[PDB]
Amino acid sequence: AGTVVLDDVELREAQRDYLDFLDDEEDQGIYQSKVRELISDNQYRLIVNVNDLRRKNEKRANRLLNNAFEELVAFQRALKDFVASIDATYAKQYEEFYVGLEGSFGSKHVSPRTLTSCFLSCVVCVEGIVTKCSLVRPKVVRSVHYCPATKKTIERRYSDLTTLVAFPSSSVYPTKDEENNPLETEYGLSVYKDHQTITIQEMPEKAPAGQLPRSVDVILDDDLVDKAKPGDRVQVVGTYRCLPGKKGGYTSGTFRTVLIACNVKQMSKDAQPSFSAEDIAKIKKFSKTRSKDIFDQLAKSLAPSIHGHDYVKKAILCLLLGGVERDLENGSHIRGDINILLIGDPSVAKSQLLRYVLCTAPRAIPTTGRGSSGVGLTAAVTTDQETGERRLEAGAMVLADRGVVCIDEFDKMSDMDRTAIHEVMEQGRVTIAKAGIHARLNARCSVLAAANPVYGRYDQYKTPMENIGLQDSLLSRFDLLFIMLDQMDPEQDREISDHVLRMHRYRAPGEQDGDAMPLGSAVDILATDDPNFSQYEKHDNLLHGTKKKKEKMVSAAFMKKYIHVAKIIKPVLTQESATYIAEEYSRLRSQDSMSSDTARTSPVTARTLETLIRLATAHAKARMSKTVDLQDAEEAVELVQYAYFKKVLE
Amino acid sequence: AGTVVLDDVELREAQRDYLDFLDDEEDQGIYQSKVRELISDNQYRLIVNVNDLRRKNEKRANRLLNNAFEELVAFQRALKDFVASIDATYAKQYEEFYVGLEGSFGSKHVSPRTLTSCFLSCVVCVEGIVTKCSLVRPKVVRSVHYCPATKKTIERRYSDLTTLVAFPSSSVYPTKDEENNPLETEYGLSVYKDHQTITIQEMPEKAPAGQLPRSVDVILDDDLVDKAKPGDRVQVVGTYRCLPGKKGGYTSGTFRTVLIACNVKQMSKDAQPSFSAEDIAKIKKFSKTRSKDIFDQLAKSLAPSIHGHDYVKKAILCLLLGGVERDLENGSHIRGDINILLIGDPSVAKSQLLRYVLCTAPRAIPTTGRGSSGVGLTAAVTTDQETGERRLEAGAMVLADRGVVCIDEFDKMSDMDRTAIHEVMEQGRVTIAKAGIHARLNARCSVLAAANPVYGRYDQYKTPMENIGLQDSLLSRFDLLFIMLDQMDPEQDREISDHVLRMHRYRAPGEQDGDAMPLGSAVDILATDDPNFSQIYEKHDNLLHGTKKKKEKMVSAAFMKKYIHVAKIIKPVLTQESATYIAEEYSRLRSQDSMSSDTARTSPVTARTLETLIRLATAHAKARMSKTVDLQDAEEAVELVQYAYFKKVLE
Amino acid sequence: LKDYALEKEKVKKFLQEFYQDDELGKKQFKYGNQLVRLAHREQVALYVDLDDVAEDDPELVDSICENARRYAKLFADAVQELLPQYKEREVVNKDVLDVYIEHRLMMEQRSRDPGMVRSPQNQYPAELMRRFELYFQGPSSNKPRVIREVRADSVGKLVTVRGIVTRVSEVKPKMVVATYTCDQCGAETYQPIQSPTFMPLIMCPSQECQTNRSGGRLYLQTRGSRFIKFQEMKMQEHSDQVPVGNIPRSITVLVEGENTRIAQPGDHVSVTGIFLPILRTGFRQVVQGLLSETYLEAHRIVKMNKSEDLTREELRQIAEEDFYEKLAASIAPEIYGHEDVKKALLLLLVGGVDQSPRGMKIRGNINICLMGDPGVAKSQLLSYIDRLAPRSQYTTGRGSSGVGLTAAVLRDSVSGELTLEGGALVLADQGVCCIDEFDKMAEADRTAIHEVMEQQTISIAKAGILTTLNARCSILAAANPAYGRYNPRRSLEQNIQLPAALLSRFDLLWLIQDRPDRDNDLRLAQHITYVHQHSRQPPSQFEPLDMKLMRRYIAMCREKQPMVPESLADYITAAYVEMRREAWASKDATYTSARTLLAILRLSTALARLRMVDVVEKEDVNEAIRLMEMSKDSLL
Ligand SMILES: Nc1ncnc2c1ncn2[C@@H]1O[C@H](COP(=O)(O)OP(=O)(O)OP(=O)(O)O)[C@@H](O)[C@H]1O
Ligand SMILES: Nc1ncnc2c1ncn2[C@@H]1O[C@H](COP(=O)(O)OP(=O)(O)OP(=O)(O)O)[C@@H](O)[C@H]1O
Ligand SMILES: Nc1ncnc2c1ncn2[C@@H]1O[C@H](COP(=O)(O)OP(=O)(O)OP(=O)(O)O)[C@@H](O)[C@H]1O
Ligand SMILES: [Mg+2]
Ligand SMILES: [Mg+2]
Ligand SMILES: [Mg+2]
Ligand SMILES: [Zn+2]
């Protein structure tokens, strides 16, 4: 053969439609700005919301989603044309520009179980958990060969025939000149694109509870390779395709299918935020208006469904803001995470606070007493069994690096596990070694833990030392230790019960009118978008989640935005704050700090001094202060003074 | 496997050298002018003299003559670049611009016999005669297809793998879409180049005597195809190459070789002369300065080695100049060709006049009395024997179209041959037919014949009718008849013997140095270039041993050739004074009482004699470059006819 | 794109006339002298510093870095063609490879007929005849890369990466040029080897066997063939360049030649090399295309921060009477207090001197157990010493237990068989093993540590393994004594809770208790707030030494074997018998044995090493005894 096409009508029309869609200037300017932004960010993939195409062109959107390969070829040619129009040299740098897809794939949004053969050559959106990743390998796309005898230089092109027919002429590597002079390959002048394969499995929480998991293979090519690691929950948008078998004279009719990714995005749509100019202005005004009691307002707005526990909510706000790590020049390290332990009577809502943090913070990992044992909590070392090499496996605390581990039923863990937690809790790292490999994994996680005292209910007539069952070294790791009692006072009972009944009465606004909460039975989730991978008035409207209109509460979305901005602040200890903190620490170390019939809940060590510093720093962050002023220090000291002592009754 | 050459150092150097040679603007821009000129007249092949390339870059010259395709493709890339620089639109209008070669090939000048295997892939110059041309076939170079099912149009290119390995995927003609939808070809959108194979044989007069002839197959591609016809003596320059066999599995090691032409040229005698502006100025000067006696100056300068026969020489000049053909509106035709017959005693230099006209005139064909027999003289009809069809074959008088047939020993020619040439000698065409084919071939020729009288010698005492053994129908279409008579007068013998002995003592300057013998033997010809296809011209010959001394010069042979070429194109128009004089002259010629007793008619006077008065007057006017046939022209015509048509019978 | 003849002329000019003033401001033609040494077979590896090339041809450096195999070949050719004119005398034929080379050259000149045109396959391959290796020291203008980020866009480029060596194979013969001989002809055939595997030749291609059309079967031979030292190492990302939720990424480094035997497992290295592919033939691959493995082809291996391989004032502070105190106070200056603890840790870094009398080895290593209350910088001191010591390993709790401390047999990758890999105590052999949370260490590990601390070996007789490992490592342990806290109501040996054997193995059992104390708590809190405020320890009288300088001083003190005089024997004996009498008489004392006397002796020899004297003096003994006494001071 050797035929060329003379202005194919469908490809011409498609490229015209796609370039019309991309050239957004008479329209809102969205994708024209996006293409500028990839030029400036020095990238060559544009992610296109398919809903925008449906809005602009139903016919393109449907044809693209149902005939993915040639449509995507048209739309990448149109993208290259458009990029050249904006900037021809940038378009000259990259051989091809790519298009990823995003948005709402209605029936094309599948799971690895539901990705059947009717989606072949369609765009699909598959969600699952990465079970295995291959190594990132380079695949040669253009080899350059020098002939030392003739001084000639040769280039050979290898087209991407991953899912196409590949005749053997298409894969020969040149080794000889025409008259059998040897060629030497120019590695630096050749072009490679790196290639990866991952397997996506149906998420265990979404799989039918009875049977074995279903998987799909995914080919990742350049820009997309290291986007996912084993254990990650990801969306992969791409084309579902049959791979060719080898040449043979006989075939079973059986084909091996893969998904060729055009886009990979993490479930952590909570690990990447989006700030508009108005959002930033709102944050700045919220911080400037009341730069004194802003912390209290944020704390009291934290777990609105839980009544009470004002100090505990302040402490959780400090944990969510964190301190600042000290990275000394000689490589030494002081941690900047706050670890909190909640001891208390049954049914005082400490699991509710852990659940709130789980649904609120980014990179938050849940774990219960005996459901994460040994190597499931810190890292593990296993042997590859294919290459025979040792590999690392990240446990709960490595996966929560720069995040939170919410350890529920902390008292029901084994002592082996609780002593494995020590190094992560203080030095923020996991050190694991077998013979062929030794690593030091970063686990810079804060620990929010909830436990019951020994005897299940807290005895008020015993010291907190013997109600908590924890040894002093472990207790020292937790910088704040809250005893949450069930004081059966009638007045506090009235407060709690009125609150609880108001939350049991609340009905969502208009969305519901007397109806039930759907179970979400695995075909309903694929019907809509996944909120996990999905795409701000500073206050909530008041109805009866609160009794009366006397004090406003911060919006959850705005609070996420505000805390994300404030977490980056690095306030500095001022000399007055440092002197005050030092004096308070020396007072607190002393016996006069505790009266008679009051007892220490946890020991006061140098870790308590860093606790004061970290709490004061978090308080300063809440105000966006850039300095740790005396008010921050005294707030931290009252937190510590509250948590570290308990009156014992007779 | 599909690779591209990122860097070919040799190709870069070659293309740079060829573009440098072509730019030429600093070096009196000869190829600059040649390329602009091919752009002007809408060609796409540039004929390159390899002597110029050898001057400018000898290393390229050797590489090109010895590695012909590599260097020729480099040189055609360079030529396309040069054309695009001069004119990008014309350059894009043609896909490929070809380079033909010219000039002197040292050992690369061969014949079909000496073209051996040591010349494969070299540029060679081969001279010979065309034995068979094929039909001009189109070869598809780019096929365009349309699928009505999907409205798609595809195109598929076919590289010229004539002398390269062709894999079967190279020649598959697409019939179906990938979905097995029928394709239909767009013939007017597809590109075809035409193709022809000829066979060139060693020339019979160059081959070793008695051996069988040797041939070479020659490939002609677009714009080179119809350049030769069977029986032409051509010079072909091309690459000598071994043709691929068909995909076998067993090979005998034998390859068919072929010449891939890059240029074809005819005998340069028949080609349009090159005319420098000084030459046209010299011609205009000649014609204007000497007008009354220019005809005699040209005539006596015709065959300088032949002494006397001044009227014969005037007539032969008229034959070389010709009358003007009349092409009436109703298709009727009147010939402008002059036919001349010389009858004479033995050894009166009439075979020499025939030979002179053979040397001088363009498109002059020799023949002897029985060397041509009918079919060999006029056309022929044969059967192709491989297609079963009738094929026309041109004989001597068709090949002499717009030329001269110099028939020698015309009397010893058989009667049927002369009957055959009756129709050509008046109508200038050959009517030929077997049952499957009929044709009316153009043979617009003038016949110059030499005959001997009956009894071998002319008898002064017998009537010229009784002495020329030809009938009035044959004689009457010979519009001038000259009895060249050997009178043994002693003073005439003085003159002739002096002239002849003087011609037998002359040595050519420089070439001859005192005792040299001229011959070369069957290798010396191929050692140097052929003076038959080879590419400052004075007016009068300098004085020499040809003439003693006098106040009357001798027109140079080269200048006379250029002058006659220019003058032959003229179409002088008969004026009314000339017409009246010629009419009354003819009426007087017909009436015998004007002519003396004891004076017989050599040839009859018919209306053909009037037509020849007109033709001779027109040729005279052409010589003066008049554009009108004046009374001097008519008088010269009448005096020539008067001299020729009557002879004194003695007793 | 570029003419390699011009480039070879460029590199020839650079080699011939590049000069510096390296030896005391003297222009010396840095690469000409090395070419001389290479021509005399006195030097094998030539390292071309691309900083030098950039000094006078920066675009040559850019070309080198963007196609590095090509320029390694060009530089090797230039050196080959320059060597004959830098030869001043005759090589003494150091080894057998040289004998082969000069026999081949002799026979080639003997049957030369120089004007004749030979076949291109009828000479010696260039790599068969070199005896030199050429490497690049990448320009300092190229920033070091992260192993994760060395990808397909850097194939064929000269890159530098940094990492920890996790696994390095043994040096093995990799064949470079296979040499065969014929049973018919007496010529040699040569097969240069680029692939990871080769198919040995069968027939010889010699001219004399092609003329004879004989069988000419050829025989593969190690004798005339050419091999190179070859190691394969894995190298891991540093903890500080791994992304947030990830594990470190390994790269395979193919080390060969003079670059072998530099990196051992656990070393912090910086590797310059070319990033190259290995074709992945064979594997019936899911994806069509030419997929390949990658590796780093090593050019320059440099051991980094703690693995790193003096001015008159320097010797001035070494000879200063307070050198010991200054070094000890440089130990983690961000931890306040712990002055004598830092002195003891300094002695552990220096160590005593091993004695081998009449076939009875007694170690010189010093072991220290910090058993303290919570939050007293034990883990910070352990981590600092791990950062500082040259061969240190840090282990915590039970994350590296069992074969993470001892060895395990592991499937080799290079050939494929069962190779022994060492754990922490092998990677820390002749260094420091920091064992944090010692009291919470699996009992099998504790028994292994028994044998390590006294015999300095690990004996294993499990199924796949029957070996004795060298573990000559000092042990720096940290523990909490009993229930997290020291309580005075219970004796030592009850809140120490170490068996007398394990307890006695430690030269110093340092007790730390943080009893609250108002002014002391203020001093600590001020120190800590300053550290949090400026990311450094507060200014003091003497600025603490850099870790590089501390390493240099400790290393100099290491090869300083001092001896114990006969004159001190009575003084030392009296100190020992005294310590032993308090142990017997006291009712709150730990186990005392002859190991206490050996502890005196090796502590005092470490002090003497710190003074860089060759004889232990009474003050060294005095300070050693004071340290042993302070180690149990907090219980007073
Ligand atoms: N202010 C409050 N105090 C106590 N319980 C509350 C409060 N507000 C709500 N609750 C409700 O109490 C119920 C039980 O709380 P939860 O299960 O979180 O208790 P818990 O402390 O985890 O108990 P346990 O220690 O046995 O796990 C929850 O449904 C929660 O909604
Ligand atoms: N007038 C003349 N001037 C010069 N040469 C002459 C003349 N007459 C005869 N000759 C010489 O006589 C020789 C023979 O002449 P030629 O062969 O042309 O005679 P011819 O007339 O053809 O004889 P025939 O009629 O027998 O064929 C020629 O070489 C020619 O040079
Ligand atoms: N002089 C000092 N004494 C005690 N602690 C200090 C001192 N200087 C700093 N610190 C702080 O102590 C904190 C670390 O606790 P550390 O590493 O001491 O635990 P540890 O000694 O191993 O105790 P545990 O027995 O509970 O494991 C560090 O953040 C460090 O900044
Ligand atoms: Mg609970
Ligand atoms: Mg004759
Ligand atoms: Mg510790
Ligand atoms: Zn042999």
Coordinates of C-alpha atoms and ligand atoms in Angstrom, one line a residue, chain B residues 350-351 408-409, ligand 5:
Chain B
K350 CA 28.0 15.2 -61.8
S351 CA 28.3 12.6 -59.1
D408 CA 22.7 8.9 -59.0
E409 CA 22.8 6.7 -62.1
Ligands
MG5 MG 29.0 9.2 -61.5

